[PDB]
Design an enzyme around this catalytic site. Sequence first.
Site, mmCIF file in Angstrom:
data_model
loop_
_atom_site.group_PDB
_atom_site.id
_atom_site.type_symbol
_atom_site.label_atom_id
_atom_site.label_comp_id
_atom_site.label_asym_id
_atom_site.label_seq_id
_atom_site.Cartn_x
_atom_site.Cartn_y
_atom_site.Cartn_z
ATOM 1 N N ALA A 169 2.550 -2.426 -1.952
ATOM 2 C CA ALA A 169 1.147 -2.050 -1.855
ATOM 3 C C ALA A 169 1.093 -0.611 -1.378
ATOM 4 O O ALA A 169 1.518 -0.313 -0.258
ATOM 5 C CB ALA A 169 0.379 -2.970 -0.900
ATOM 6 N N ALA A 174 9.504 -5.084 1.593
ATOM 7 C CA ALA A 174 10.052 -6.209 2.340
ATOM 8 C C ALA A 174 9.731 -6.184 3.828
ATOM 9 O O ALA A 174 10.193 -7.069 4.554
ATOM 10 C CB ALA A 174 11.574 -6.248 2.165
ATOM 11 N N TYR A 214 -11.895 -6.542 -7.971
ATOM 12 C CA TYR A 214 -10.612 -7.146 -8.314
ATOM 13 C C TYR A 214 -10.588 -7.811 -9.686
ATOM 14 O O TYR A 214 -9.497 -8.020 -10.228
ATOM 15 C CB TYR A 214 -10.223 -8.167 -7.248
ATOM 16 C CG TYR A 214 -9.890 -7.539 -5.917
ATOM 17 C CD1 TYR A 214 -8.656 -6.947 -5.695
ATOM 18 C CD2 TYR A 214 -10.812 -7.537 -4.884
ATOM 19 C CE1 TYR A 214 -8.348 -6.368 -4.482
ATOM 20 C CE2 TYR A 214 -10.518 -6.959 -3.666
ATOM 21 C CZ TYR A 214 -9.284 -6.376 -3.467
ATOM 22 O OH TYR A 214 -8.989 -5.804 -2.250
ATOM 23 N N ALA A 253 10.082 3.518 -3.199
ATOM 24 C CA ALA A 253 10.494 2.580 -4.239
ATOM 25 C C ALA A 253 10.030 3.000 -5.626
ATOM 26 O O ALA A 253 10.541 2.473 -6.621
ATOM 27 C CB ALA A 253 9.954 1.184 -3.931
ATOM 28 N N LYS A 288 -4.721 -5.188 -12.597
ATOM 29 C CA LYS A 288 -4.258 -6.569 -12.682
ATOM 30 C C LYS A 288 -4.171 -7.041 -14.129
ATOM 31 O O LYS A 288 -3.344 -7.904 -14.445
ATOM 32 C CB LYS A 288 -5.174 -7.472 -11.854
ATOM 33 C CG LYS A 288 -5.091 -7.183 -10.355
ATOM 34 C CD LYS A 288 -6.106 -7.981 -9.549
ATOM 35 C CE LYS A 288 -6.239 -7.450 -8.126
ATOM 36 N NZ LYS A 288 -4.936 -7.277 -7.413
HETATM 37 N N1 LIG Z 1 -3.254 -8.627 1.608
HETATM 38 C C1 LIG Z 1 -3.752 -9.555 0.802
HETATM 39 O O1 LIG Z 1 -4.778 -10.196 1.080
HETATM 40 C C2 LIG Z 1 -3.076 -9.882 -0.489
HETATM 41 C C3 LIG Z 1 -2.046 -9.150 -0.954
HETATM 42 N N2 LIG Z 1 -1.321 -9.519 -2.093
HETATM 43 C C4 LIG Z 1 -0.169 -8.711 -2.601
HETATM 44 O O2 LIG Z 1 0.851 -8.692 -1.624
HETATM 45 C C5 LIG Z 1 1.702 -7.549 -1.880
HETATM 46 C C6 LIG Z 1 2.038 -6.854 -0.585
HETATM 47 O O3 LIG Z 1 0.853 -6.222 -0.052
HETATM 48 P P1 LIG Z 1 0.348 -6.684 1.421
HETATM 49 O O4 LIG Z 1 1.176 -7.738 2.056
HETATM 50 O O5 LIG Z 1 -1.126 -6.853 1.092
HETATM 51 O O6 LIG Z 1 0.318 -5.678 2.667
HETATM 52 P P2 LIG Z 1 1.516 -4.758 3.194
HETATM 53 O O7 LIG Z 1 0.968 -3.332 3.289
HETATM 54 O O8 LIG Z 1 1.769 -5.573 4.404
HETATM 55 O O9 LIG Z 1 2.939 -4.468 2.410
HETATM 56 C C7 LIG Z 1 3.237 -3.234 1.716
HETATM 57 C C8 LIG Z 1 4.731 -3.103 1.541
HETATM 58 O O10 LIG Z 1 5.005 -2.086 0.549
HETATM 59 C C9 LIG Z 1 5.911 -1.146 1.089
HETATM 60 N N3 LIG Z 1 5.693 0.148 0.456
HETATM 61 C C10 LIG Z 1 4.510 0.815 0.273
HETATM 62 N N4 LIG Z 1 4.630 1.950 -0.372
HETATM 63 C C11 LIG Z 1 5.991 2.038 -0.630
HETATM 64 C C12 LIG Z 1 6.769 3.000 -1.304
HETATM 65 N N5 LIG Z 1 6.266 4.097 -1.876
HETATM 66 N N6 LIG Z 1 8.101 2.781 -1.389
HETATM 67 C C13 LIG Z 1 8.607 1.674 -0.838
HETATM 68 N N7 LIG Z 1 7.973 0.695 -0.187
HETATM 69 C C14 LIG Z 1 6.657 0.939 -0.118
HETATM 70 C C15 LIG Z 1 5.680 -1.182 2.592
HETATM 71 O O11 LIG Z 1 6.823 -0.678 3.274
HETATM 72 C C16 LIG Z 1 5.512 -2.687 2.791
HETATM 73 O O12 LIG Z 1 6.798 -3.299 2.825
HETATM 74 C C17 LIG Z 1 0.966 -6.684 -2.907
HETATM 75 O O13 LIG Z 1 1.562 -6.818 -4.192
HETATM 76 C C18 LIG Z 1 -0.460 -7.244 -2.876
HETATM 77 O O14 LIG Z 1 -1.135 -7.067 -4.116
HETATM 78 C C19 LIG Z 1 -1.682 -10.714 -2.751
HETATM 79 C C20 LIG Z 1 -2.703 -11.441 -2.342
HETATM 80 C C21 LIG Z 1 -3.565 -11.086 -1.185
#
Ligand SMILES: NC(=O)C1=CN([C@@H]2O[C@H](COP(=O)(O)OP(=O)(O)OC[C@H]3O[C@@H](n4cnc5c(N)ncnc54)[C@H](O)[C@@H]3O)[C@@H](O)[C@H]2O)C=CC1
Length: 405
Positions: free
Chosen positions: A146, A55, A241, A118, A250
């Site tokens: 992620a 979040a 991907y 998490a 995926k």
């Molecule tokens: N960045 C992109 O271009 C795209 C990303 N997504 C999806 O969006 C989702 C979020 O990733 P993003 O926004 O890319 O970047 P992000 O790195 O900004 O967000 C990652 C989040 O996961 C949390 N996190 C990571 N490891 C953790 C753990 N072990 N325990 C608890 N929290 C943990 C982090 O604190 C953060 O809140 C993913 O499911 C990704 O597949 C979907 C489409 C495109």
Amino acid sequence: GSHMLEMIIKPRVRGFICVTAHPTGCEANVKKQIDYVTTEGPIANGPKRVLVIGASTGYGLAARITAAFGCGADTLGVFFERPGEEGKPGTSGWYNSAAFHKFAAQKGLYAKSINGDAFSDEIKQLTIDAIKQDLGQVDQVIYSLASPRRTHPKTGEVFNSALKPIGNAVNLRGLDTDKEVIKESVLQPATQSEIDSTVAVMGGEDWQMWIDALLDAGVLAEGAQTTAFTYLGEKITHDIYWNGSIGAAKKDLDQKVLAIRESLAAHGGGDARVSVLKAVVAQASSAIPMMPLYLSLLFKVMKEKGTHEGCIEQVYSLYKDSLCGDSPHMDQEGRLRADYKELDPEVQNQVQQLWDQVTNDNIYQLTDFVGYKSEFLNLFGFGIDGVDYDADVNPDVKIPNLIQG
Ligand SMILES: NC(=O)C1=CN([C@@H]2O[C@H](COP(=O)(O)OP(=O)(O)OC[C@H]3O[C@@H](n4cnc5c(N)ncnc54)[C@H](O)[C@@H]3O)[C@@H](O)[C@H]2O)C=CC1
């Protein structure tokens, strides 16, 4: 002298990661996203008790902001971030979440967060405890994790994801953002264990465990909804991907969502969906050389069409149109799609044509690499309008109602 305890924070880039973050800029970034949501307007008939797993940054942060300030939801956040301390700025996700709590309180909205792994059982139990104590049940679960690694909660094995094709090796063009050169590199195919490891980290098992543990504890409301965010993209990145190790992960999600949907639709007509979102700059983007190049091209092309946007615009539409509205973008597997403007055939044709013309010499004439660099620094709170980057700040920003796991 609190000058000993405060500092001037500047970006420090080591490899391809920014290892600092600015708390004032992160707060202004969260405020900009909140203001976008309230300007666009409320979203009716959304959830009011929302758990967001992941979040603190990116799409998960945008979902938390949309739910809270668009739908008026009380939100419980889970993330894994580093607090600040003297001389050592915390992570952007920490400062983002500090700002979220601040603005949520101003508007009379519940904001509690849990900081920890998490993937562990212990954090799942702490999350259940919080829902029981505060909310009773939640009616929506956003899954937006992620991570490059996962410690399995039963066996303790540490899994590491791999970014590799399957079958044949492949040559992938990319952009090295440190040296600012176009560079190709050959990725070898993934071993079977690299596939299995990536499925474990990036597939749907943990998502299912979250539903499983929450159900066993009885904290999901009737008609409850859950969605997991992912990216599919198109031809340029498909070797990874679609058909690669990450593709295998995926393929896990399109199956797990069916089982999850079955459990919820018997629970007062709840629902579950894989939600597919557009490519954006994220913290880890610069370390995968293909993405800075793809994003820099996509940004320029979509800006010329008036369709460029980032996390909050994407997720506000996902809530308004698909999760809470009556114009969903279902696809043939039963996935909610918010990425349709990235996958416009003419956009993709233009990006793919520019992909084969970009060189070290025309980078700035053919791409929006400028925009990529600005949006990357923005993630960590740098380059934000109205922020005095010459002013001292205390890096130890605290968060009320932060449960440390
Ligand atoms: N960045 C992109 O271009 C795209 C990303 N997504 C999806 O969006 C989702 C979020 O990733 P993003 O926004 O890319 O970047 P992000 O790195 O900004 O967000 C990652 C989040 O996961 C949390 N996190 C990571 N490891 C953790 C753990 N072990 N325990 C608890 N929290 C943990 C982090 O604190 C953060 O809140 C993913 O499911 C990704 O597949 C979907 C489409 C495109």
